[PDB]
Amino acid sequence: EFNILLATDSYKVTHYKQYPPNTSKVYSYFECREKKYEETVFYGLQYILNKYLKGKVVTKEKIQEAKDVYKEHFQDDVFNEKGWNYILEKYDGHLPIEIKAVPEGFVIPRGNVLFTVENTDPECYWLTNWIETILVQSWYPITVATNSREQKKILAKYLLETSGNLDGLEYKLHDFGYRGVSSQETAGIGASAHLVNFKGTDTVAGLALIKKYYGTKDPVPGYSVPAAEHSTITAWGKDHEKDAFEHIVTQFSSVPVSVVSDSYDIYNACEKIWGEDLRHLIVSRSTQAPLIIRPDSGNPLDTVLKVLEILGKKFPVTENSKGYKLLPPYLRVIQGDGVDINTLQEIVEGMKQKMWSIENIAFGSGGGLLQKLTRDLLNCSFKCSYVVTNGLGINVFKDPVADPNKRSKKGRLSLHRTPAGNFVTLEEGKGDLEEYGQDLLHTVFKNGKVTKSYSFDEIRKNAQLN
Amino acid sequence: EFNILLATDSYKVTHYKQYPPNTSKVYSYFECREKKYEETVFYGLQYILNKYLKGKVVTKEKIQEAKDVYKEHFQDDVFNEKGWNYILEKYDGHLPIEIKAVPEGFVIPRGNVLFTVENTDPECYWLTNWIETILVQSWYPITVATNSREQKKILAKYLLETSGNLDGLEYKLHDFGYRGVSSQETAGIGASAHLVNFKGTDTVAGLALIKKYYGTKDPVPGYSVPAAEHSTITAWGKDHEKDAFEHIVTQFSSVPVSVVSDSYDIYNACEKIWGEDLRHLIVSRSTQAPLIIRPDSGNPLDTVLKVLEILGKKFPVTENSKGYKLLPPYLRVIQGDGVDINTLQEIVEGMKQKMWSIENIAFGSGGGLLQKLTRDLLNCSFKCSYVVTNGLGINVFKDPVADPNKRSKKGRLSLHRTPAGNFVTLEEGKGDLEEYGQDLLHTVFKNGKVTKSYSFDEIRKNAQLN
Ligand SMILES: Cc1ccc2nc(-c3ccc(CNC(=O)c4cccnc4)cc3)oc2c1
Ligand SMILES: Cc1ccc2nc(-c3ccc(CNC(=O)c4cccnc4)cc3)oc2c1
């Protein structure tokens, strides 16, 4: 069972003894610090609030479990048993904490406050930064959603230029990353962040998370299609790849079906098997049930161009209104190997230079989409900016001499949209002057209750592209 | 609640209709494919077996939940309800699967079979690769433990060369990565893998995982020390950094204490505050309660060298038997910023060139230790190598023409220890002759039961260095 008393950096156990005496308030904030990724999608905090922070999170058994662990962990008795018992007795195990945050799905430029945390009881000054570790992990859904959205910008640009519209954009980047992430929980978190921007996923864990913690009026927030893996091809034997292809496309004759075609020779498979031997089974397929050919090895751009060239010689290629080549509607391609934001850019530019419409292709991304990301990509950071000690408020900050990029903000913070539509974070409590509009940070958590929730539809709407 | 019917890649739902008709057996294996990191630590499978695969994992309610999700997910009725109902009725929801694996903690060279999976009921041919996604996630504990062990090799070599012994080696790489990983579950898994090689961690989640799933004869597998963060320094105000330092080292006068010293000026803190104003509180400390100075910004190597040079002018430095400089025993340093396996090598090499002993220092690693890792680092992969169709066993494999590095093995596999202590993987069932000895793969899971378990002490012994 999860125990919030055991869900922090070990050294934070010792911090209640280190603050200035008579500290009654510790006020801290989260930002994606300025160091491309000029704007970030704020997403994932609601999951953390509901799963870990709300309700009765302190019990007498959890206090004793933490006391016994930390006794051995530090070889010393430093655990603040009295502080946690105070929360258990006065608030029935509810955290005396207030959290204000920008609405989820909001797209905020780097270097702005995204949420703030402060204690609501003077006895619990130490609690604000106790939960830093749990809250900082929101870097991951933020970073997945942001990196996924940046790839949507690339796809939208090249889809618009080669087709004149954005039809099918929401299905052009498919989540392949279930096996390539570090845990089941990460898979669900990361997949849901990708679904902020797209509707195609094979990481089923993301569906249950959205349903339980955000909710959507759609039947499911993400969709997939029947498809083969190498095992369902290679199980037929090396000499019977054609029989495997024939069986699978016949089993799935009325729906879209993706067949991985590089088990032995992707180019042979496209030219001879799909393009000749089984060509009669492909050209008869409906527009809503195309064959999707999946290469999965080699240089991603060179393979895509070589596959398109081969398919263009065996199947009738037309030209769309913008003048770019378009496979017949019963034939599409997905490149699901070696795809990250960098190679995605190279492939669509390479296809455009060869006058291929992006309508022909979608992309599958696994580790590049959900795992090859770190907290340093957006510099997601949690810092104390304001304290009250013996009734005196003090604006606090760090400013390391050897790294000015690590300087943190001072005092009580607020986020505002200027009349020109820019964003500004006001420091030192200057938001009290009301020079701008209302503070964009709203109370989402207070004293054990989630006070403001967003549906997955609202988040998707807030995160739309221009 | 976890539902194994929803814990797979979406497209695997459709694979039972894609295998050759009358397929009764699908046999698959896991390896860290060939083409640094020449040997891998096998760790983490036992966690997956107990938490996700053992016991009654199929219920009628879970079948209905999966049926509803996949109906909307595919906009189609493709879910294999009949196959999962059979397992519920025939085996009381226990998976008819056998898994054989190398003992956890074993250090195996790349390109060897690590575990195999096969169905034990011919009706459940499809189940072997259904659970590929869950099992492939063992890449993460394998990769964390392997990458952590390689850093232990680097530290051991330079600690031995600069000091003549290995004292304190198991505390030279401390886990700082709780906030920098993608989820709570990842934190526990990754922290436990690091503790295979070291005993210093602040990611508390690793302790509970080891206690629940592996066990150790000591009360806890990992330890930490009291330490400050920037907030317990900066909360005193910029003009009172000295007062914060004094308060913290006095609170923790009899135990080791780490004080982050770069909030405003690391060089001022070492030269003026630690080196003059508070020097009398440091030189009086015990050898078992040193002050640990923590820089946290700037170039990691240059900052360490500049901090050590400053301390050498204010504190008595000796030269050890090997000829390297050594701080007094009441004063140590931890570099916990910008550390991964690459910068760790550069720092200890840089310290050696300046004649500084590794005895002086430990390293904290966060994202670099637990998050900046992907499945392609060791090429952890799961592939079907053997099937039975119409009573005929067929050795199957993939072999993409454009990437021979992705070729997979053929037939039934076994792992053997050579007389010289090497490892060899025999393919095509050729392991039955036992020319070098018994198969090192042992059944760890069969028909819903974990049949072989290892303690964390056994794993640590298996994963030790030469
Ligand atoms: C033009 C166009 C538009 C939209 C498309 N959607 C797909 C598509 C969706 C789903 C899958 C099945 N999943 C996998 O192959 C897989 C592989 C590795 C790990 N996990 C899953 C295949 C293809 O292709 C499209 C093409
Ligand atoms: C020579 C020597 C040997 C062994 C040592 N162990 C430490 C040491 C252990 C633990 C902590 C406290 N944790 C953190 O500072 C922290 C920072 C970020 C995220 N999470 C935690 C400090 C220092 O210093 C050593 C020095």
Numbering used by the authors:
A (entry chain A), B (entry chain B): 8 to 42, 53 to 483
Question: What do the paper's sentences say?
Answer:
Nicotinamide phosphoribosyltransferase (NAMPT) is the rate-limiting enzyme of the NAD+ salvage pathway, having an SL relationship with nicotinic acid phosphoribosyltransferase (NAPRT), the key enzyme in the NAD+ Preiss-Handler pathway. NAMPT exists as a homodimer in solution 29, 30.
To determine whether A4276 inhibits NAMPT through direct binding, and to elucidate its mechanism of action, we solved the crystal structure of the NAMPT-A4276 complex which showed clear electron densities for A4276. A4276 nestles in the U-shaped central β-sheet of the second domain, adopting a V-shaped conformation with a kink at the C10 atom. The structure of A4276 comprises three parts: nicotinamide, benzene, and 6-methylbenzoxazole groups. The active site of NAMPT can be divided into subsites-I, -II, and -III, which accommodate nicotinamide, benzene, and 6-methylbenzoxazole, respectively. Through extensive π-π stacking interactions, the pyridine ring of nicotinamide is trapped between Tyr18 and Phe193 of subsite-I, where the substrate nicotinamide ring binds. In contrast, only one side of 6-methylbenzoxazole interacts with Ala379, Ile309, and the hydrophobic part of the side chain of Arg349 in subsite-III, while the other side is exposed to the solvent.
